[PDB]
Symmetry: C3
Subunit: 70 residues, 3 copies
């Protein structure tokens, strides 16, 4: 009785710990990716300004991207 | 008896809700990152075409990236 | 008795499987995003070198990005 319930509680704790650990690992990556994609957007944006093509590059960019996303 | 099992069921529900909530939050970010990285790839691609260096920029890009990834 | 506990164990397994499946799906995306953002950083970096503006583009990039991130 007591040991079946204690066995069950232990599996609940293992599931909680294992999955929370995987999630935290995936979170760390996703936060890193968010920062990299912001950095890349900034840098691309600067190059666009340097070349003085910002406005047309942007419209072409937004429509092709929306097309790629469907 | 009934209350030990009910206590257990309640912890299973809390684990389910909490983790599902974290996952959904991480999912939202990852989908945002996917859209940003597509947009950035498009824009970089357009700049490459504007500068008329697309083919050589691409080969240099793919090999350095594969190297960075090992 | 036996069937309440067996019912409980079954829900623990469903929670484990379902959430692990969502996590693995989100992981796959995050690993894809990491590779795309590296590729984009490389390509942006190459364009910068081609234009011979690498150093100034970088400083402008890092500070605007840090500003965007607060
Ligand atoms: C080799 N170096 C230093 C550079 C520097 C700036 C440049 N800007 C451009 C702007 C437009 C363009 N078109 C063909 C539209 C071609 C180029 S090529 C180019 C090469
Ligand atoms: Cl991500
Ligand atoms: Cl990116």
């Amino acid at each position: 009785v007591k040991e079946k319930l204690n066995g069950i509680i232990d599996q609940i704790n293992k599931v909680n710990l294992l999955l929370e650990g995987e999630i935290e690992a995936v979170r760390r990556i996703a936060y890193m990716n968010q920062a990299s994609s912001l950095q890349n957007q900034v840098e691309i944006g600067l190059i666009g300004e340097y070349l003085n093509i910002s406005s047309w590059l942007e419209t072409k960019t937004l429509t092709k991207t929306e097309e790629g996303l469907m």
